[PDB]
C-alpha cells in the first residue's frame, strides 16, 4: 500500500502528506531545492470575535410572519439581518527548504513514496554513482517532523536548510528559527472585501504568536548555523528536526500570553536530539502501527504494475484496480491518524495540510456536512480515540453556542450554525447580510454534531463518557430544539426560518432560500430527540425530560412524499432550483442518521431512494462520498462501486469544472480544489458496504459490488461494543468472527445459514423473524460463524 | 505585439523574459509570492582550463592511416585519444523574491504581459477594490533590473523583498546583498560523473566571485532592511532596483582580482536610485525603441481575439494567425536586443536566461549550428551592432585556437571545435575519450564562425573593420585549413579525420563516425577560402595568398550526388544510420552558406533538395528553423510555411519526445527543452523568405507562401550596404524602397517588371536575364520601385 511516483512533485497536490495530528508537512521530493510545506493545526488568524447578533432576535418574529404568509422574497431579504461575521482562516505555517549541493540532474530510477504501513516518506535518487536517500515522517511520540538524509559515499552530503513563510515573521539563530504574530483577520477566499489580510500593531495585536525551530545533527563533516540557515558540509548522514508551536491554549480556546511557543519548541527539539535516529524511527513505527494495523482489507489482487506511479494508476485503472480501492480505503484511515490524534484539533476542510494564506473556504470547519463527514470513519474503521478531537471541539461549541442561543434567539441550550473555526464561532456567518441565506442561515450545526457525541457511545458503550460528557451536551442541544420549534397553524411543531443546505426552492421564475420546517431540520431534530431519549433511559435519569422530548417528537410536522414520488426536501412540494444539486440534505435521516430505514419508514425510505436517483451520481468529491454510504444503506453495491469509480477519477490543478469530484495525483480528495472530506467518506462508505450495525443487528455484506467476488475485512467495529472480521468467496459470505466487549444478546443478518461456535464448540442461535439470528455472547470471547 | 496571460506563470517556460544583454530576468507574475529568476551573462563555472591535447598530434597520422585502410571502427576508437575536456556551464544567478501582504486571491481579470514595443512587463490585478500594478524591465542605459509597484489606495502597498540562490553564497545588509565564489567545476547535464558540482576551497579557489545588490525606494510608508530582506510597509508606490556583477574581465577572458563585484553593483545602484522613475523608464524606452523599431513587419490583421493568452493563441491558431507569425518574427529581434547588446556576452544556448545549476548541454556555445544560428538574424533584421558580442567572442577563440591548432595538430592558424564556453575553449570536448567522436571530433567550428565575421562586412561594408578585425582572423582560419587539408591517393585535397555533425554512416549493421572529407568539411573550407579571396581583393592585398587559396580550393575533393539522387553527406555513398537525422550539415552550403546555388551548381543544388526531402520536415526547434531558411533558398514559400507551422506547435514542459520541436507558452523555442536557437532561426528564416541578397542581387519575395496574400516589411538589410522596404498585394510585389550607404550599381531580381524613381525623377534601369535589372544608386538617396 503505497502512493508513489518516479518524479518529484511539481504541484502541491502531487506532494506527499505526513503528520502527527498537530504538525503537518507536504513532501515534494525535489532533487536539488527541496520544499517541505509546513503546518501546525492551531495556526489560525484572529481571536475570539464578537460574533453574536442581538438584532437576529429582534427580527425573528417578523421573519416568521413573512414565512407564514409565504412572502419568501421578503423573508430571504430580512434574514440577512440575522447573520454574523465570516469565520477566521487556517493559515500556512511556512516551508522547510533544503538546498542540496549536487545539482538537479539524477540517474534514471528516481523514486519517492509514502508507505501507508509505516507512515514514512522515502525519496531515493543517484548522482554520479552516489546514492542519496531521504526518510521523512512526523512522529507523534516525539512531537516533531524528522528528515533523515544519507549519501552512499563518505562526505558526499552537503546542504543548507532553512525556514521561510508567507506570514510576517522574523528569523534568527544552534537552531534556525522563525517567529511572529498571526494576522488578526483574514477574509475568506470567496469574500473579495477590501484589506483581506490584517495584522495588528506588533505592540497590541491579539493574534496568536507562533514559532518554528529547525535543528540538525550531522554524521561526519561540519555543521554551522547563521542567517542563511543550517549548513552541513562534508557529512555522510544527517538528521533534521523541526518543531512548531503557538500561543493558542486548547483549554481556554484562546491565545495565552503566558504560553511561550519558542520555549515549547526548544523543549521539544532538545528532547528529540537526545535520542538516536533508530530509536526515534522505531518509536514512530510502533506508535503508528498500533493504530493503522487495527484494520486489514483485501478485495483481491491488484491488476496494476507494482512500479506504476499513483497518478497513472488512478487514470488508467480507477476502481477497476481493487488494490487502488484498498489503498483509497486505508488512505482515509492514514489521513485521520496523521491529522486527528487526541490532544490535537479536529481535521478541518484540508485535515491539517494547507499552503495558502486565504485557503479555499477558509479551510475551516463547515458544519452542514463536511466536518461531520471527516469523522464518518472514526468509529467503524477502528480509530475511536481519533474521534476525540471533534468530541472536545463540540464541547467548546456547546459552551460558545449557549451565548449564541441566548442572544440571537432567546433560547435555552446551545446552537451552532454552518461554519466554525479554531475559535469555535457558533454564530452564523455571512458578514451580517452579505451571505446568501440559503447557506448562511442554518442553525442545525449543533443538532447534527450531537450525533457524533452519541455514536462515540453507541460504538464503545462507555457509560462514564455518556453520563459526564456526551449526554449533558446532547441534552442542551435538544433544549435549544425544544425552543426553536414553534407550532404552525395546524398545530404541528416546525422551525422557521428554515433552509436546506445550499439548495433553493423555485416558484415561477424565482428561487428562494427560507421557508418553514425543511426535511433536514425535522430529521435532525427528530434524531436528536431519539438519541437523547435513548441516552436518558440508558442512564436511568430524566424521566420527565424524556416525556417532553417524546411529546415534541410526536408533534413534529410529518415528512412527506412529493408528486415525483420523492421524499420532499421542503414542507411544501416546491420545484428544485437544481434537480442535480450536490447536497442531499433531506436524506440525512437515511445516512449518516438512522431515523429513516426500510423498517422504521418503508414508504419514506423508498421515496428517499427516488430522491437520490433524481439527484444523480455526479457531484463533488464529498457529494460522491455521501452517496456511497447512502446507496450502501439502500443495499445497492453495484451503484456504490459506480460512485467509487467516479471518485477515482484523476483531477488536475487546472480543472475548470467547479463541481467535478475525484482525486489528485497524491490521492487527496478533489472538490475541486483539494478537500479532505472526500477521502474520509470514501473510507466510511467502503466500510458501510461491508458491514452495518445501525438497525439493531449486525448485517454482513449489505452492499457488496458484484465485481468484488473474493475478499475479507478485519477489525471493523459495530454498535454495541463489537469488533468484526468477515470473509467472502464467489460473492458470498463464508466466515465471520465477532468479539463483544459486553455480555449481551447479539443479533445478526446474513444471507446464508451460519453455524455458531465459540472455542470450537457450538453456540445456540435462534433464527428469528427473518434470516436474523440472535445468540448470547460473553464479553471478550470470540464467536465464529461458518456456512 | 504582446506575449500575455490571464494567469500568473506556474512554470519557468510560462514566465516572461527581459534583459539588457548582461542582466536577465524571467517574470512569473505571481500574486503573493512573486519570483523573478535572475541571470548575469558572465556567471559561469570554472576558469581557463588546460584543454589542449598533445597526444592528438601523436595519433593523427595513425588515425589517418586507419581511415585510408577503411578501418573505421579502429579509427573511431583511436579518435577518442584526440579529445579534450567538456566545457564549463552557464550558471543561474538566483532569484528576487517579493512577498506581498495581501493574500493570493484576486478579482477577475488578472493580467500580465510583455509588450515587445516597449520591452516592459506589466502585471495588474485587483484585491478588494484596490488595484495593484507592476512594471518590470531591465534597462541598458542604467544597467539594472527595475521593478515598479503601485497600489491604487494610499498605504495599501506592503511587501518584503530579498534575494536567494542555488549557488553557495552569503547574504548581508541600506541594500540587501548576496555574494560568493562560483564553483570551479560543473559537469554537463548529460555527463553523469561523480561529484558534478565542485567548489574550490576558499583559500585558493579560482572561481569568479559574484555579487547581487537589491535596493528599494518607497513612496509613502516606511523602509527597513535586515537579514529578512527589504521591508516596505504601508507605502503607496515603490521601486526595487537590482544589480549584479562578477569578477570576470571581458578583455582578458578570465576572472580578475581587481574587479570587485560588490563595488560595481553599489556604484550602479547608488546611481540609478538618484534618478526619478519616469526618467528611468523613458531612458529605457528611448534606448529600446531605437533598436526595435528599425524593422516593421505586417502580414495582415490577427484573427485571434485581442485578449487571448499566448499559449491558447499558439495552440488554437498556430501559423494560421498571421499576427502570431509577426509576433514570432519580432520576438526573435526582441530576444537579441535583450541578450546580445554591445559589451555583453553573445547569446548562448538559452540567450542569458537559465534557472538550472546543470543546465541542458551546459547552456554553452555549441558551434556545430546552434551558436551560429543565434546570429542568423543579426544582419538581415537590422541589429548589426548586436552581432558584435559574437564577433568579439570569435576574436577570443582565434587567440585561444592558435594554441589548440599548434598543440593538437601541429598546424598554423587557429581552430575551434564543437563546444565553447565563457572561457573560450577551442579544444574538442568528450572528457578525453568519453564523448562520441561523431560529435566530439569536429574541428570546423572556427571555419564556420569566420562566415559571421565576413557577413558583418558584406552587409555593412566597413573597410576598417574588415582590414583590422575580420580579415586577419579569417586568414588565420584559412591557414589552418591549408594545413588540415591533405592529399588523398588521387591527389585531391581532403580532411581526415572528418565527421558530419551528429550523424554516423553505416556499413552493414554497424554505424561509424569518422571518415575523410565529409561534405560539410569540404563546403565550409571552400566557403572560407572563397570569402578570404574576396576579402583580400576588396582590401587589395595578399596577391600570393589569394592564388594559394584559389589553387587549394580547386583541388578539393568534388562534391557528389548519391544513388538516391541526393547530395552525398560523406566522401563515400554510405547508408544513413538515421534517414531522418535532425542535422543537415552537408547542406550548410545551401544555407547559411552560399556555396551551392542554382546558378553555381545546378545539379548539386537539386540533389541537396532531394537530401532535404529525405530528411523530412520534423525535428527539434533548431532543425525546423534551419529547414525554413533552406526551403527559403529553394524558393518554396509554401514549404517554408509548413515548417513554420511545425514550429508554432505548443509544447509543454512534460514533453516526452526528446526531439519534438515547437514553442512554449511564452513563445520560447522548444528543442525540447528550451533552446533559443529556434527563436532566432524563425526570425531569420522569415526574413529570408521575403528578401535575399547572397547572389549579387537583391531578390524580392523569393519564397512567399501562397497564403501570405498581402503585407509588407520595412527595415530589412541587404548585402552591399542596402536597407530595404517592400510591400505586396494579391501575392505580387507592388512596391520596393531601397537606400544604399554606398554609391554603386544596384542589381535587383523581381518576378515582375518595375519602374525606378528617385525624388520624382525616373531612374534608368537595365534589364537582365532571369528577371533581373540593374541601376545606379547614389549613397543616401531613396529609390522607389513600382510595377
UniProtKB/TrEMBL annotation, chains A, B:
Domain Glycosyl hydrolase family 95 catalytic: 276-690
One record GO biological process: carbohydrate metabolic process
Domain Glycosyl hydrolase family 95 N-terminal positions: 3-249
Segments forming domain Alpha fucosidase A-like C-terminal: 692-785
Molecular function in Gene Ontology: alpha-L-fucosidase activity
Pfam family, one: Glyco_hyd_65N_2
Entry-linked PANTHER family: ALPHA-L-FUCOSIDASE 2 (PTHR31084)
Protein name: BH0842 protein
Naturally occurring in which organism (per UniProt): Halalkalibacterium halodurans (strain ATCC BAA-125 / DSM 18197 / FERM 7344 / JCM 9153 / C-125)
Amino acid at each position: 500500500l503505497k502512493i508513489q511516483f518516479d518524479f518529484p512533485a511539481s504541484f502541491w497536490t502531487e506532494a506527499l502528506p505526513i503528520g502527527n495530528g498537530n504538525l503537518g508537512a507536504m513532501v515534494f521530493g525535489k532533487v536539488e531545492k527541496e520544499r517541505i510545506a509546513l503546518n501546525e493545526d492551531t495556526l489560525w488568524s484572529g481571536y475570539p470575535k464578537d460574533w453574536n447578533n442581538p438584532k437576529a432576535k429582534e427580527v425573528l418574529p417578523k421573519v416568521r410572519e413573512l414565512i407564514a404568509q409565504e412572502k419568501y422574497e421578503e423573508a430571504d431579504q430580512l434574514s440577512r439581518d440575522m447573520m454574523g461575521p465570516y469565520t477566521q482562516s487556517y493559515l500556512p505555517f511556512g516551508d522547510l527548504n533544503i538546498f542540496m549541493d549536487h545539482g538537479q540532474v539524477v540517474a534514471p530510477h528516481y523514486h519517492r513514496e509514502l508507505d501507508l504501513s509505516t507512515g514514512i516518506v522515502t525519496v531515493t535518487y543517484t548522482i554520479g554513482g552516489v546514492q542519496y536517500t531521504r526518510e521523512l515522517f512526523v512522529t507523534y511520540p516525539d512531537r516533531a517532523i524528522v528528515v533523515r538524509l544519507t549519501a552512499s559515499k563518505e562526505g558526499f552530503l552537503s546542504f543548507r536548510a532553512k525556514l521561510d513563510s508567507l506570514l510576517r515573521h522574523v528569523s534568527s539563530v544552534e537552531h534556525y528559527t522563525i517567529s511572529g504574530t498571526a494576522p488578526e483577520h483574514v477574509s475568506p477566499s470567496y469574500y473579495d472585501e477590501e484589506n483581506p489580510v490584517r495584522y495588528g500593531h506588533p505592540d497590541m495585536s491579539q493574534g496568536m504568536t507562533f514559532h518554528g525551530r529547525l535543528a540538525a545533527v550531522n554524521e561526519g563533516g561540519s555543521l554551522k548555523v547563521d542567517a542563511d540557515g543550517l549548513h552541513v558540509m562534508g557529512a555522510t548522514c544527517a538528521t533534521l528536526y523541526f518543531s512548531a508551536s503557538t500561543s493558542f491554549d486548547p483549554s481556554t480556546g484562546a491565545s495565552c500570553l503566558e504560553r511561550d511557543p519558542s520555549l515549547r519548541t526548544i523543549e521539544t527539539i532538545k528532547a528529540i536530539c537526545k535520542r538516536g535516529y533508530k530509536e526515534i524511527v522505531n518509536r514512530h513505527l510502533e506508535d503508528y502501527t498500533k493504530l493503522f494495523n487495527r484494520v486489514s482489507l483485501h478485495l483481491g489482487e491488484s491488476i496494476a504494475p507494482a512500479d506504476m506511479s499513483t497518478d497513472q494508476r488512478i487514470k488508467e485503472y480507477g476502481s477497476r484496480d481493487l488494490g487502488l480501492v484498498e489503498l483509497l480505503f486505508q488512505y482515509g484511515r492514514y489521513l485521520m491518524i496523521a491529522s486527528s490524534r487526541p490532544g490535537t484539533q479536529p481535521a478541518n476542510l484540508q485535515g491539517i495540510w494547507n499552503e495558502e494564506t486565504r485557503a479555499p473556504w477558509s479551510s475551516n470547519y463547515t458544519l452542514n456536512i463536511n466536518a461531520e463527514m471527516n469523522y464518518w470513519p472514526a468509529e467503524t474503521c477502528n480509530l475511536a480515540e481519533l474521534h476525540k478531537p471533534l468530541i472536545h471541539f463540540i464541547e467548546r461549541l456547546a459552551a460558545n453556542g449557549k451565548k449564541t442561543a441566548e442572544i440571537n434567539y432567546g433560547a435555552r441550550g446551545w446552537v451552532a450554525h454552518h461554519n466554525a473555526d479554531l475559535w469555535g464561532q457558533t454564530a452564523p456567518v455571512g458578514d451580517f447580510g452579505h451571505g446568501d441565506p440559503v447557506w448562511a442561515f442554518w442553525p442545525m450545526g449543533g443538532v447534527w454534531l450531537t450525533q457524533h457525541l452519541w455514536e462515540h457511545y453507541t460504538f464503545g458503550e462507555d457509560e462514564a463518557y455518556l453520563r459526564d460528557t456526551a449526554y449533558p451536551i446532547m441534552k442542551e442541544a435538544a433544549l435549544f430544539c425544544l425552543d426553536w420549534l414553534i407550532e404552525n397553524e395546524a398545530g404541528y411543531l416546525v422551525t422557521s426560518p428554515s433552509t436546506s443546505p445550499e439548495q433553493r426552492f423555485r416558484i415561477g421564475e424565482k428561487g428562494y432560500a427560507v421557508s418553514s420546517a425543511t426535511t433536514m431540520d425535522l430529521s435532525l431534530i427528530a434524531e436528536c430527540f431519539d438519541n437523547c431519549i435513548q441516552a436518558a433511559k440508558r442512564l436511568s435519569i430524566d424521566e420527565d425530560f424524556v416525556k417532553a422530548l417524546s411529546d415534541a417528537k410526536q408533534r413534529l410536522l410529518p415528512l412527506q412524499i412529493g408528486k415525483r414520488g420523492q421524499l420532499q426536501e421542503w414542507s411544501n412540494d416546491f420545484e428544485d432550483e437544481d434537480v442535480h444539486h450536490r447536497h442531499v440534505s433531506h436524506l440525512v435521516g437515511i445516512y449518516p442518521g438512522r431515523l429513516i430505514t426500510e423498517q422504521s419508514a418503508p414508504n419514506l425510505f423508498e421515496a428517499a431512494k427516488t430522491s437520490l436517483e433524481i439527484r444523480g451520481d455526479e457531484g463533488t468529491g464529498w457529494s460522491l462520498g455521501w452517496k456511497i454510504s447512502l446507496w450502501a444503506r439502500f443495499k445497492d453495491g453495484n451503484r456504490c462501486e459506480r460512485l467509487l469509480s467516479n471518485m477515482l477519477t484523476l483531477i488536475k490543478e487546472d480543472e475548470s469544472m467547479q463541481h467535478r469530484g475525484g482525486v489528485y495525483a497524491n490521492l487527496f480528495g478533489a472538490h475541486p480544489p483539494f478537500q479532505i472530506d472526500g477521502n474520509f467518506s470514501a473510507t466510511a462508505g467502503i466500510a458501510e458496504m461491508l458491514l452495518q450495525s445501525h438497525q439493531g443487528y449486525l448485517e454482513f455484506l449489505p452492499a457488496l459490488p458484484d465485481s468484488w467476488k473474493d475478499g475479507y475485512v478485519k477489525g471493523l467495529r459495530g454498535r454495541g461494543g463489537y469488533e468484526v472480521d468477515l470473509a467472502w468467496t464467489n460473492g458470498a459470505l463464508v466466515k465471520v468472527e465477532i468479539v463483544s466487549t459486553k455480555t449481551q444478546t447479539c443479533e445478526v443478518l446474513t444471507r446464508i445459514s451460519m453455524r455458531i461456535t465459540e472455542s470450537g464448540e457450538e453456540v445456540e442461535g435462534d433464527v428469528l423473524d427473518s434470516g436474523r439470528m440472535s445468540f448470547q455472547v460473553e464479553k471478550g470471547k470470540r464467536y465464529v460463524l461458518n456456512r
